[PDB]
Design a protein around this ligand. Sequence first.
Ligand code: ADP
Ligand code: ADP
Ligand code: AIR
Ligand code: AIR
Ligand code: MG
Ligand code: MG
Lengths: 383, 377
Amino acid sequence: MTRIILPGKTIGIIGGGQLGRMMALAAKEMGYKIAVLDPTKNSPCAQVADIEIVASYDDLKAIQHLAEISDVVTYEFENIDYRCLQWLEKHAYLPQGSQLLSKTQNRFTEKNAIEKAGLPVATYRLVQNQEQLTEAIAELSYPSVLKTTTGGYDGKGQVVLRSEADVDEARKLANAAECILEKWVPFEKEVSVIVIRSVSGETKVFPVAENIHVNNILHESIVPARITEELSQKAIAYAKVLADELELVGTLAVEMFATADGEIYINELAPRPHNSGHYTQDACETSQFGQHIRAICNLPLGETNLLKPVVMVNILGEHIEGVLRQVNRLTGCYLHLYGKEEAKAQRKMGHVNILNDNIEVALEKAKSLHIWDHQEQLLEGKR
Amino acid sequence: MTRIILPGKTIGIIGGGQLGRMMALAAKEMGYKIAVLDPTKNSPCAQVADIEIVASYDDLKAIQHLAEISDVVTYEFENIDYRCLQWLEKHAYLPQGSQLLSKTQNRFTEKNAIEKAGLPVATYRLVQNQEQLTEAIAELSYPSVLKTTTGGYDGKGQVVLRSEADVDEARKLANAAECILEKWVPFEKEVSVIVIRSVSGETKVFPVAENIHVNNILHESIVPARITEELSQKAIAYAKVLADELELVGTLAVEMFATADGEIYINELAPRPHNSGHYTQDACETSQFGQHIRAICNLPLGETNLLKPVVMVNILGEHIEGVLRQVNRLTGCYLHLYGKEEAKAQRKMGHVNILNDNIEVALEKAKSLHIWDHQEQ
Ligand SMILES: Nc1ncnc2c1ncn2[C@@H]1O[C@H](COP(=O)(O)OP(=O)(O)O)[C@@H](O)[C@H]1O
Ligand SMILES: Nc1ncnc2c1ncn2[C@@H]1O[C@H](COP(=O)(O)OP(=O)(O)O)[C@@H](O)[C@H]1O
Ligand SMILES: Nc1cncn1[C@@H]1O[C@H](COP(=O)(O)O)[C@@H](O)[C@H]1O
Ligand SMILES: Nc1cncn1[C@@H]1O[C@H](COP(=O)(O)O)[C@@H](O)[C@H]1O
Ligand SMILES: [Mg+2]
Ligand SMILES: [Mg+2]
């Protein structure tokens, strides 16, 4: 309510990946102490934490131990089960609560909640068996997209249905998992907005980012998004309605499709700092992580003004040697590396924020470094 | 020379105070590891370091152990025995070198480096005994200031001589330590410029800050400095010349006196990030701390554009209670606290950067919080 977590207190983080690490580094500038729970020793967050607890996420004893030594608890890992979430809510201080998190773990549930909040989404149907798939294909026609409702840390369970010739692969997906069938949205841009809401109801919204995915992994975020002033205003208003309606405490990332015609469809929500918000570390007055900490500790929120245009580029395992090799060429670039021990080809290892007065020059900078030639080549065929 | 210390390597820091802490936080965002040597456990910097070495600064064994685990070494306070820095220069990797520190560690030898580069200083005389003090006073007249050549602590530091009646206070200081007597500079404003130069010779300068001291402790830094454009250009030019002539690697803070006739006297040099540079964490494209790491590791330097006007306000021991009690009123304020355990009245505990499109609105916010009532005379 009016409850404040003062500097000097301990912030407990569930999950020790890069999101937890950047939260921690933000909290440390303000003099907070950090405890982290992660299943692997020497996690990115653990490298900046005062206290490390190595345990499984579903281990209630370990969760209780984190809670016991923390003045406030937050998470970067979303898939926390109901028994741990309830324990934390009632026996520790978890200002984000569990309601929003319970709405966002299932695609169908999420879409229902978005519509209940008064916002538009692609027309969708629940698919729990072959018969519901057949009906959904009838009602939505082609083209359409069948996705799993839960899990998939990459986007593994997705089948795009362009013709009757696609039905058989969709049936295979519907066999392995509860699914959702969505109308295919013709759109020009994928954009996202990070919205922040504090314990006391104060809200701030970041600018709209334009997001470029390659292999279903975020490649670039571009701010300002290359859209009309009217599309931006709409994306921002939608994000605000969601934060109000969902009674957000903490950070909410809202991912959207923007059509040439100026309509927005909400694609998905993440109740946490998000990859499409990393630009904020170097280009805005407050980062999504500093905002996250203020929101849960109930400090006044910072400003979210864009101070300079930016292009964020992800560094995957496949890019790390190229980055190190090209280090002398990183003028106008702000490098972030997460300290991950084991590199893997599509593992997120870091990101680089390219700040420039002109967005097209920053984009040209990423191309001229030649680190992401693979991504740039995959970006054709285009449309 | 073209040598590069890559992200992933370990940076060793001598000293575990707030400057080292903020270096470390900057370094970790790029994926560096951090070793720190400090005599007291759980120092501000150790709370963020991967490796902590608790030992004295003169403990050569521990210094050896610092070098061993580090791919590059830097320091975060000046009162290191320049002899320890000479061991690291020859047997480890200390791109900043020992010579720049030795020159700026002594107010007298510092004057000489400034004069060599051709810039104005207050006319000065070395004072080693009462006879020399008498001759210096006769030569330089009133008003004048007596300063110890070395040391940045203790209950002495300096004596301002307005008239003959201040002399007895000066005689006491003159007996305690080696001093210089300097002509009093009539200045409109104190300003500072932080200049950065990498191992490869790339040079960046930050915007000129106007600094306001109370009890000879920095209270506020104001950026942009409320000075004319020509004065700003001169400050910047003077800092570049200094970095050039001193063969600077790393960070250099240059403190200056801006006079009514538009002249600049160099007051003091610091071969490290400086309190008057903390504004850069929130108002510049790159902080003095990110620039420092980039300089010594030989990465390209970041840009130093002022992205928004700012007033940095110091948080001393006397203020910490007020800050924590007033946290709910810090809209538009960016708070930095260093993790120091013991508040002492005039100990630097943290700082707050107040960002606002209007410098006077930032300044007014500082007053309206009422935390610094002591300072606002
Ligand atoms: N209804 C739809 N219409 C058009 N394109 C879609 C639709 N659903 C998904 N996509 C495309 O597929 C990509 C992945 O879908 P998404 O729902 O974001 O799953 P994930 O969270 O696994 O990435 C999106 O970035 C978008 O390009
Ligand atoms: N020659 C001088 N003329 C006028 N004021 C001075 C002079 N020297 C120092 N001061 C004032 O006293 C303050 C402290 O002096 P300084 O030499 O910076 O000592 P310290 O390095 O211990 O702070 C300065 O910030 C300035 O305001
Ligand atoms: N991307 C994402 C979605 N939800 C969490 N993450 C971040 O990705 C890390 C997982 O990365 P890895 O699989 O490389 O350990 C998590 O800990 C968290 O920071
Ligand atoms: N202010 C200053 C001038 N030179 C170094 N410092 C910083 O102040 C710390 C010492 O402060 P304290 O004496 O409060 O511990 C040092 O380690 C360094 O970071
Ligand atoms: Mg997606
Ligand atoms: Mg000084």
